[PDB]
Amino acid sequence: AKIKARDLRGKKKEELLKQLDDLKVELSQLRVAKVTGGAASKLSKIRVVRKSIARVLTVINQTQKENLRKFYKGKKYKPLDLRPKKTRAMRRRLNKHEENLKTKKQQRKERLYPLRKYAVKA
Amino acid sequence: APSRNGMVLKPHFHKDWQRRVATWFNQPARKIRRRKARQAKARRIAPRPASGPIRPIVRCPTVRYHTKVRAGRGFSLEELRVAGIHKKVARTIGISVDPRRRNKSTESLQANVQRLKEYRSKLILFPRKPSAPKKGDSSAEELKLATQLTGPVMP
Amino acid sequence: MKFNPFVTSDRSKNRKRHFNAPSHIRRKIMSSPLSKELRQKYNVRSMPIRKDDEVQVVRGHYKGQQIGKVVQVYRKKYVIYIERVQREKANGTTVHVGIHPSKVVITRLKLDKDRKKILERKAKSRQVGKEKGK
Amino acid sequence: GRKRPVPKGATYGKPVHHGVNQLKFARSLQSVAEERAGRHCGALRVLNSYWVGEDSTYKFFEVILIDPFHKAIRRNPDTQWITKPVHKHREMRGLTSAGRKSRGLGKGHKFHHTIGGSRRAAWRRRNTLQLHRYR
Amino acid sequence: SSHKTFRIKRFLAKKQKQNRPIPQWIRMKTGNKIRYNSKRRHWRRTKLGL
Amino acid sequence: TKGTSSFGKRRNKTHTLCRRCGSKAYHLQKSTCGKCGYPAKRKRKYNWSAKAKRRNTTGTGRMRHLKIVYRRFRHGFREGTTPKPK
Amino acid sequence: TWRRWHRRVNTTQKRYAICSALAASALPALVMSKGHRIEEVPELPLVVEDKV
Amino acid sequence: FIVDVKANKHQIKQAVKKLYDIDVAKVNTLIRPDGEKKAYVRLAPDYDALDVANKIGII
RNA sequence: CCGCCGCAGGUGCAGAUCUUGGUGGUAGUAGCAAAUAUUCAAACGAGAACUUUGAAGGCCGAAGUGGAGAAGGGUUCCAU
RNA sequence: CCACCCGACCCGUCUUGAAACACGGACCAAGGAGUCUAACACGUGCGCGAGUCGGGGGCUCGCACGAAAGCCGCCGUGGC
RNA sequence: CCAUCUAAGGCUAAAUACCGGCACGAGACCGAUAGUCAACAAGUACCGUAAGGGAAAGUUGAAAAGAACUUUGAAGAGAG
RNA sequence: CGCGACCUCAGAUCAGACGUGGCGACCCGCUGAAUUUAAGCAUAUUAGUCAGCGGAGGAGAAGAAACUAACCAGGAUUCCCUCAGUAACGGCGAGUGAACAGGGAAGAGCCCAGCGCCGAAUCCCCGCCCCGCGGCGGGGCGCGGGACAUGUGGCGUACGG
RNA sequence: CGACUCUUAGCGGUGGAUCACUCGGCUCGUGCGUCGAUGAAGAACGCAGCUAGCUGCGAGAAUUAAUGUGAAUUGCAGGACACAUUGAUCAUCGACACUUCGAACGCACUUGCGGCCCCGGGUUCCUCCCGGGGCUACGCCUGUCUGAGCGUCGCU
Ligand SMILES: [K+]
Ligand SMILES: [K+]
Ligand SMILES: [K+]
Ligand SMILES: [K+]
Ligand SMILES: [Mg+2]
Ligand SMILES: [Mg+2]
Ligand SMILES: [Mg+2]
Ligand SMILES: [Mg+2]
Ligand SMILES: [Mg+2]
Ligand SMILES: [Mg+2]
Ligand SMILES: [Mg+2]
Ligand SMILES: [Mg+2]
Ligand SMILES: [Mg+2]
Ligand SMILES: [Mg+2]
Ligand SMILES: [Mg+2]
Ligand SMILES: [Mg+2]
Ligand SMILES: [Mg+2]
Ligand SMILES: [Mg+2]
Ligand SMILES: [Mg+2]
Ligand SMILES: [Mg+2]
Ligand SMILES: [Mg+2]
Ligand SMILES: [Mg+2]
Ligand SMILES: [Mg+2]
Ligand SMILES: [Mg+2]
Ligand SMILES: [Mg+2]
Ligand SMILES: [Mg+2]
Ligand SMILES: [Mg+2]
Ligand SMILES: [Mg+2]
Ligand SMILES: [Mg+2]
Ligand SMILES: [Mg+2]
Ligand SMILES: [Mg+2]
Ligand SMILES: [Mg+2]
Ligand SMILES: [Mg+2]
Ligand SMILES: [Mg+2]
Ligand SMILES: [Mg+2]
Ligand SMILES: [Mg+2]
Ligand SMILES: [Mg+2]
Ligand SMILES: [Mg+2]
Ligand SMILES: [Mg+2]
Ligand SMILES: [Mg+2]
Ligand SMILES: [Mg+2]
Ligand SMILES: [Mg+2]
Ligand SMILES: [Mg+2]
Ligand SMILES: [Mg+2]
Ligand SMILES: [Mg+2]
Ligand SMILES: [Mg+2]
Ligand SMILES: [Mg+2]
Ligand SMILES: [Mg+2]
Ligand SMILES: [Mg+2]
Ligand SMILES: [Mg+2]
Ligand SMILES: [Mg+2]
Ligand SMILES: [Mg+2]
Ligand SMILES: [Mg+2]
Ligand SMILES: [Mg+2]
Ligand SMILES: [Mg+2]
Ligand SMILES: [Mg+2]
Ligand SMILES: [Mg+2]
Ligand SMILES: [Mg+2]
Ligand SMILES: [Mg+2]
Ligand SMILES: [Mg+2]
Ligand SMILES: [Mg+2]
Ligand SMILES: [Mg+2]
Ligand SMILES: [Mg+2]
Ligand SMILES: [Zn+2]
């Protein structure tokens, strides 16, 4: 049949691995057919199976990582791969809370002397 | 080599001048960019004057220019003290303050003191809370008269 | 005259974008006029040509009234093959001759869910522009 | 001072440039001390330094360093300036008190060499030929 | 030489695999200008230099 | 004998392939590369050769990661989000 | 690039050129000399109402 | 067999053993000039290579 | 693609032992002369002074024109 | 194209003097050398004139042309 | 005598620069010996131990319709 | 003897973080020629330039006077026009060469230490719970730990407080 | 009488000028102005059914997911559940993936040699062997633990 990532979403971990195994077995047979003569139909199935394996593996990896993110959600420390990447320099910049910190002296100035809305008559 | 009658010239072209030549092909683009920034700033700060805060009258120094006056950096602390304006408040309401300037003569001090008072009459002060006004300009005054004063404030 | 500063009028640029356009853009480039009856029926002037569309060749040596089906849209070559638009190779093999889709007129459209969605978008917009011109 | 590090004292030039000894470094030994402390501790920011002693061969300075990623530093708005990336290796760009003393900065008749921010900035401005569009 | 490191042997492997003529069907493809492999190395004429 | 005859005795390699830059300039006895300066931490680069600088500068390779950063910049380096499902 | 591309013209001389150009545009002999096909034009200068 | 260059004789023996459900007596590996690793996998005497080749599809 | 009125310039070649590309006379010329040597028959083949096989006459002559390696080469190895 | 009569040495160059037993040039094609910037002088053209000049800036709901053009005047600061 | 500031601690946007980079627009520019070295599998082929040096090279046709078939030749190559 | 406190040190694959290298047009800090000009040449010039080294950012650096002036005075920095090829420097040769005032572009000001007063009133880390909630945190608690009187924080900085 | 030679024209060659063309430069301008121990720049090797270069990519290798799009891709072939509308292709790209060397990180740079922890197998019940996973670089900050000192002291 046609392997679609949509169908693999609901499948369990065990049967996802089993599907991966059957595809890997089939690809090995196709590679045998490549060197043992082999019809054009068998050769052209190599790409179909190869991409089918990638489709199954992507679903497994995507499922496995999102489970980690749910487990590590709310934890103080998370694995580096599960952390925001962005750029090294953006990761090393002050956080929004630190950037919004004001000294009491600065807070007192803003309270006492706020910028006023005014107009001047010509 | 000189030839017949001519001026003795010493052109300052013995360094690698060709490496440091500033052309002005972005001058039209620079003028456009400055104009747009001026317009953007004016829209942001409306209805406050576009040019900026009011500046004082100062007399230009040296014998070459002491007959002329111009806009100064900011009103001195003595001028603000006589006018009755707190130095911290002056900046919020659009008055430039220059703590470095000292008034040597009373004529200059009175000229700027009068300038500050006349500015204060012309000022329309919007309340911080539109619903609740305390010591701000009248609703009628704010509603119609307020408009962005283009050009230097009280040239 | 063009006024958009972000749209180029450069001959080299427009030729470069045209001859290196990806296939999905080449689909739009390969649009063809609808027939008068189709234009009146759907209120649409032009559609991107599709395989299994009946067309008339209206320019070139194969111009005529014959209705032929589009059998292949070779976007890489910017040309389409029509079922009776062929010629005789030396050895006797019959090969289709490529016709640019702007030189054919669609007489029958291959309607499916996507074409019907596309047609009702163009007609809604053409009509909305009338609510402008008026 | 700073001996000219040429092999066997040979400079291979005109006599004006034949000097090897009696030469002086442009920056002070306090500036060099800050540079050494800053280079060794690349993860810290050099704030200032002060003298603590000297003998005939050595001068001793104590450099104040700040860790720019400690919370007591990043959560204090008065010291948040040192945590910004533009303040990386201030001692290596002549931005500490000891470093800036050698740049010729200052206000007035004495400091005309560095109008524009640096001696290089002033030299560039004064040696750039401004060719306007309309001449 | 018969004595060779793994890195040098792997390097010589890539150079042998690259030294092949173009497939004949490359020429039939649209917009083709490659009429023959211009990067063909002959062991006796031009040396790898390693 | 300094010419043709002396050319026959060349059978020992001064340089080999560098493990950092891939050029065949890794001096074996000196254990240093005359191209990139390996094993020095910093890359060997001189303003006296602009040609040499442009032969290996940023841009002559793959950009396996930069050309992803250039793409991600145009959207503000967003992460942790996906387009709405269809 | 630092060739002298641009040129200065005195404002008075620029204004004189506009005056001469306007004066010549009112002379049918000079407009026709520019191949402007005005043989059926009612008048020179040609003025039309402002609702245009 | 043509095998991955990363693999060693222990891995090749273990892979062949339970890919094709046979027993292996000896593994001799070489790296051919095109950079591939070729493994000569000699099976146990009870297993027949011709029989296994038929099940694989080699012949 | 050009005429006319103006505008602008990287605007006119025989030379620079000029630069790059091409082409001649020389000229079917000089030359294909270091280390003794080839011959007969057959085969294959469109085609044989030169390939192969057989026969003959020779040479290297064990410090080899023999048999194997190191370095270097890197597939040149082998078959078709 | 050819014939005949009279005339007729190979150009470029340096040079007092070149057909020179002075140098460069086998041949052909294409490329190939007083430019541009700043300054100054004088001469000529144009505008205004005891003045003259905005070149820097600003204004005109920037933007095909238009990066142009127009305007400023308590923008003439300043230059001459 | 007077004037003027208050060193030897620190922060700070704008106006400014930008022959690298990511996108984009334009030109009285060049037009394959020109324009970037590079319009092409170009920093490629190739050279050098190496640092480094570094090319040449665009165009069938509207569409391959890229010349079936006959004939001479071993074929390249011809004649129809 | 030993048991403790502190000080000065050391080890750890200790818990959690941070630096390295690249690019380098523009920017900052150093180092730094000679060709060249002077019809020779050594000071000078080239030039604080090329090459060399280090450090950054989207700008950098500079920056709120130990300023300019000498006027009826101006008033942080940077950039533009002008000042000006000027004052000045110079085998006073060749050559070199700023600034202040004026007009503009932009315009923004501030914080400590000290000196005092407030029962350290201050900060970091850890554990738990509640709420916004991709870790950004807010609060509450803890006879939890540590920093800190060799001085944290509030107030206050030459315009005075 | 010819050859031979020269000149001029026709045609044929040789050569690639000229003209026309231009998905390329050059110059100016504008907006933005973002790399890296969460492994960059660069290098190596590998990856397509037929594919060597260029390009693209990383053992999921000329691509996976997703979103948009809406019937192709194409030099040949193959697949009607691999010839698909239940989504071809292309674009976008936020998810996943991402070999070796490289600041390059166990040590060394030979695919050379270790150490610690966990899992599976060798009937493992020890040693040991094989496979797999995690970790093991330098500097530095805060904090912790373990300590050193005829450094300064207190108590006994
Ligand atoms: K050997
Ligand atoms: K001569
Ligand atoms: K001659
Ligand atoms: K899709
Ligand atoms: Mg305070
Ligand atoms: Mg302004
Ligand atoms: Mg162009
Ligand atoms: Mg020297
Ligand atoms: Mg110096
Ligand atoms: Mg800064
Ligand atoms: Mg600063
Ligand atoms: Mg200064
Ligand atoms: Mg100058
Ligand atoms: Mg050889
Ligand atoms: Mg020699
Ligand atoms: Mg050696
Ligand atoms: Mg072996
Ligand atoms: Mg031209
Ligand atoms: Mg010329
Ligand atoms: Mg010529
Ligand atoms: Mg001549
Ligand atoms: Mg002969
Ligand atoms: Mg001979
Ligand atoms: Mg003999
Ligand atoms: Mg013998
Ligand atoms: Mg002998
Ligand atoms: Mg003579
Ligand atoms: Mg002569
Ligand atoms: Mg003679
Ligand atoms: Mg001579
Ligand atoms: Mg000659
Ligand atoms: Mg010519
Ligand atoms: Mg005149
Ligand atoms: Mg005027
Ligand atoms: Mg324009
Ligand atoms: Mg204008
Ligand atoms: Mg005047
Ligand atoms: Mg005046
Ligand atoms: Mg501060
Ligand atoms: Mg041409
Ligand atoms: Mg070229
Ligand atoms: Mg070239
Ligand atoms: Mg740790
Ligand atoms: Mg660095
Ligand atoms: Mg740029
Ligand atoms: Mg001289
Ligand atoms: Mg001379
Ligand atoms: Mg000399
Ligand atoms: Mg100097
Ligand atoms: Mg330099
Ligand atoms: Mg950056
Ligand atoms: Mg700035
Ligand atoms: Mg102050
Ligand atoms: Mg000033
Ligand atoms: Mg003057
Ligand atoms: Mg002096
Ligand atoms: Mg100087
Ligand atoms: Mg000034
Ligand atoms: Mg205090
Ligand atoms: Mg001809
Ligand atoms: Mg030819
Ligand atoms: Mg997909
Ligand atoms: Mg070894
Ligand atoms: Zn290297």
In this complex, do A120 and B49 lie within 8 Å of one another by their Cβ atoms? yes
Residue in F53, F22, H45 with CA at minimum distance from that of residue E49: F22
d(CA H33, CA F26) in angstroms, rounded, equals 25
DSSP 8-class letter at B97: B
d(CA D67, CA D83) in angstroms, rounded, equals 8
The distance of A37 to chain H (nearest Cα, Å) reads 10
- What percent of chain H is helix, strand and coil (3-state, nearest 5)? 30, 30, 40
d(CA D114, CA B153) in angstroms, rounded, equals 35
Interchain contact D135–B (C-beta under 8 A): no
DSSP 8-class letter at C48: E
Residue in C74, C97, C85 with CA at minimum distance from that of residue C27: C74
d(CA B116, CA B82) in angstroms, rounded, equals 10
Counting Cα atoms < 13 Å in the Cβ hemisphere of C130 gives 6
The distance of E50 to chain F (nearest Cα, Å) reads 7
Residue in C126, C127, C130 with CA at minimum distance from that of residue C47: C126
3-state SS track over chain D: CCCCCCHHHCCCCCHHHCCCCCCCCCCCHHHHHHHHHHHHCCCCEEEEEEEEEECCCCEEEEEEEECCCCHHHHCCCCCCCCCCHHHCCHHHCCCCHHHHCCCCCCCCCCCCCCCCCCHHHHHHHHHCEEECCCC
CA angle A12, A15, A16 (to 5 degrees): 80
In this complex, do B148 and A113 lie within 8 Å of one another by their Cβ atoms? no
Hey, what are D42's tokens? 């690349």
Number of helical H runs and strand E runs in chain C:
4, 8
In this complex, do B24 and D129 lie within 8 Å of one another by their Cβ atoms? no
Structural gaps in chain D: residues followed by a C–N separation over 2.5 Å: none
3-state SS track over chain A: CCCCHHHHCCCCHHHHHHHHHHHHHHHHHHHHHHHCCCCHHHHHHHHHHHHHHHHHHHHHHHHHHHHHHHHCCCCCCCCHHHCCCCCHHHHCCCCHHHHCCCCHHHHHHHHHCCCCCEEECC
Chain centroid offset of residue D97 CA: 9
Nucleotides of chain L within 7 Å of a protein C-beta? 16-25, 27-35, 42-81, 85, 94-112, 123-127, 133-138, 153-156, 159-160
DSSP G14-42: HHHHHHHHHHHHT-HHHHHHTT---TT-S
d(CA E26, CA E29) in angstroms, rounded, equals 6
Which ligand ends up closest to the CA of D105?
A: 12
Nucleotide minimizing C1' to CA distance for residue C1:
J64
In this complex, do F79 and A90 lie within 8 Å of one another by their Cβ atoms? no
The distance of G8 to chain D (nearest Cα, Å) reads 6
CA angle B62, B68, B73 (to 5 degrees): 80
One-letter identity of residue D50: Y
DSSP F48-59: T-HHHHHHHSTT
Interchain contact D17–A (C-beta under 8 A): no
Q: Which residues contact C89 (CB under 8 A, 6 or more apart)?
A: C95
Strand L and chain D: which residues 93-122 have CB closer than 7 Å?
93-95, 99-100, 102-103, 105-110, 112, 114-122
List beta partners, residue C54.
C69, C108
Please provide the size of chain E in residues. 50
Give CA separation, B66 vs B61, B103, B155, C75, in Å: 5, 15, 18, 80
Interchain contact F11–E (C-beta under 8 A): no
- Looking up tokens 């006349």 gives B118
Nucleotides of chain J within 7 Å of a protein C-beta? 36-41, 46-48, 52-60, 62-64, 67-72, 74, 78
In this structure, is the dihedral angle defined by the CA atoms of residues E21, E24, E28 and E30, taken in order, positive or negative? negative
Q: Are E40 and F3 in contact (CB under 8 A)?
A: no
Chain centroid offset of residue F44 CA: 10
Chain centroid offset of residue B117 CA: 18
One-letter identity of residue F15: H
Interchain contact F46–A (C-beta under 8 A): no
What SS3 class is residue B25?
A: coil
* F18 annotated as ligand-binding: yes
Rounded distance in angstroms from the CA atom of residue H4 to the C1' atom of nucleotide M112: 20
Q: Are A56 and A23 in contact (CB under 8 A)?
A: yes
Ion ligand 9 residue ranges (Cβ < 5 Å): D 26
Q: Which residues contact B123 (CB under 8 A, 6 or more apart)?
A: A118, A119, A120, A121, B93, B94, B137
Residue in A27, A15, A19 with CA at minimum distance from that of residue A3: A19
Hey, what are H13's tokens? 């023996």
In this structure, is the dihedral angle defined by the CA atoms of residues H14, H15, H19 and H25, taken in order, positive or negative? negative
Strand L and chain A: which residues 36-65 have CB closer than 7 Å?
none
Q: Are D134 and G6 in contact (CB under 8 A)?
A: yes
Which ligand ends up closest to the CA of D119?
A: 12
DSSP 8-class letter at B145: I
Give CA separation, B104 vs A25, B71, B82, B97, C125, in Å: 99, 17, 15, 17, 75
One-letter identity of residue B8: V
Which of B92, B128, B153 would you mutate first to test chain A, the one with the most A CBs within 10 A?
Answer: B92
Strand L and chain B: which residues 64-103 have CB closer than 7 Å?
64-68, 70-74, 77, 87-88, 91, 96-102
Please give the helix or strand (H or E) that residue C32 lies within, else none. Answer: strand C31-33
Chain centroid offset of residue D53 CA: 22
In this complex, do D130 and B24 lie within 8 Å of one another by their Cβ atoms? yes
- Dmax (CA) of chain C: 61
In this structure, is the dihedral angle defined by the CA atoms of residues D111, D116, D117 and D121, taken in order, positive or negative? negative
Interchain contact F24–E (C-beta under 8 A): yes
- Residue B69 burial by CB count (10 A; 0-12/13-18/19+): exposed, middle or buried? middle
Cβ count within 10 A of residue A26: 16
Going by their DSSP bridges, the two strands B21-23 and D129-131 should be labelled as parallel
CA angle B88, B94, B96 (to 5 degrees): 65
In this complex, do A116 and B148 lie within 8 Å of one another by their Cβ atoms? no
Phi, psi of H55 (to 5 degrees): -70, -35
Phi-psi region of B66 (alpha: psi -120 to 50; beta: other; left: phi over 0): alpha
Q: Are B141 and B124 in contact (CB under 8 A)?
A: yes
Query: Does strand K come within 7 Å of the CB of B144?
Result: no
Interchain contact D128–G (C-beta under 8 A): no
Residue in B131, B149, B52, B33 with CA at minimum distance from that of residue B91: B52
* F33 annotated as ligand-binding: yes
Residues 88-147 on B with a CB inside 8 Å of A are: 88-89, 91-94, 119, 122-126, 128, 142, 145-147
Q: Do F and A make contact, counting contact as 3+ CB pairs within 8 angstroms?
A: yes
Counting Cα atoms < 13 Å in the Cβ hemisphere of C30 gives 26
Please give the helix or strand (H or E) that residue F1 lies within, else none. Answer: none
Which chain F residues have a beta carbon less than 8 Å from that of E49? 24
Give CA separation, A19 vs A43, A51, A60, in Å: 21, 13, 11
Query: Does strand K come within 7 Å of the CB of C97?
Result: yes
Which chain G residues have a beta carbon less than 8 Å from that of B23? 1-2
Give CA separation, A83 vs D73, F74, F78, G38, in Å: 23, 21, 13, 78
| R_g of chain A, CA atoms, integer Å | 29
List beta partners, residue A118.
B125
* F77 annotated as ligand-binding: no
Rounded distance in angstroms from the CA atom of residue B63 to the C1' atom of nucleotide L45: 40
Interchain contact E20–H (C-beta under 8 A): no
* F14 annotated as ligand-binding: no
Chain centroid offset of residue F4 CA: 36
- Dmax (CA) of chain D: 64
One-letter identity of residue F64: R
Structural gaps in chain F: residues followed by a C–N separation over 2.5 Å: none
Rounded to the nearest whole angstrom, what is the distance from the C-alpha of residue E38 to the centroid of ligand 42?
19
For F73, name the nearest residue in chain A, comparing CA atoms only. A86
Hey, what are D29's tokens? 């030994």
One-letter identity of residue A42: K
Nucleotides of chain I within 7 Å of a protein C-beta? 69-76
Nucleotide minimizing C1' to CA distance for residue C81:
K63
One-letter identity of residue C104: V
One-letter identity of residue F78: R
d(CA H23, CA C41) in angstroms, rounded, equals 75
Please give the helix or strand (H or E) that residue B147 lies within, else none. Answer: none
Give CA separation, D78 vs A102, E17, F54, in Å: 9, 65, 45
Please provide the size of chain H in residues. 59
Chain centroid offset of residue D111 CA: 17
Q: Are A56 and A2 in contact (CB under 8 A)?
A: no
Long-range contacts from C95-102, C-beta under 8 angstroms, 24+ separation: C96/C71, C96/C72, C97/C62, C98/C74, C99/C57, C99/C60, C99/C62, C101/C30, C101/C31, C101/C32, C101/C49, C101/C73, C102/C31, C102/C32
Rounded to the nearest whole angstrom, what is the distance from the C-alpha of residue F50 to the centroid of ligand 49?
25
Q: Are D17 and D11 in contact (CB under 8 A)?
A: yes
- Residue D31 burial by CB count (10 A; 0-12/13-18/19+): exposed, middle or buried? buried
In this structure, is the dihedral angle defined by the CA atoms of residues D5, D7, D12 and D15, taken in order, positive or negative? positive
d(CA G33, CA F36) in angstroms, rounded, equals 74
Please give the helix or strand (H or E) that residue C110 lies within, else none. Answer: none
In this complex, do F24 and E49 lie within 8 Å of one another by their Cβ atoms? yes
d(CA D39, CA G34) in angstroms, rounded, equals 78
Q: Are B153 and B54 in contact (CB under 8 A)?
A: yes
- Which technique was the structure solved with, according to the deposited record? cryo-EM
d(CA E32, CA C67) in angstroms, rounded, equals 35
Q: Are F71 and F64 in contact (CB under 8 A)?
A: no
| R_g of chain B, CA atoms, integer Å | 24
In this structure, is the dihedral angle defined by the CA atoms of residues B49, B53, B56 and B59, taken in order, positive or negative? negative
Strand M and chain H: which residues 9-48 have CB closer than 7 Å?
10-11, 14, 35
Interchain contact E50–F (C-beta under 8 A): yes
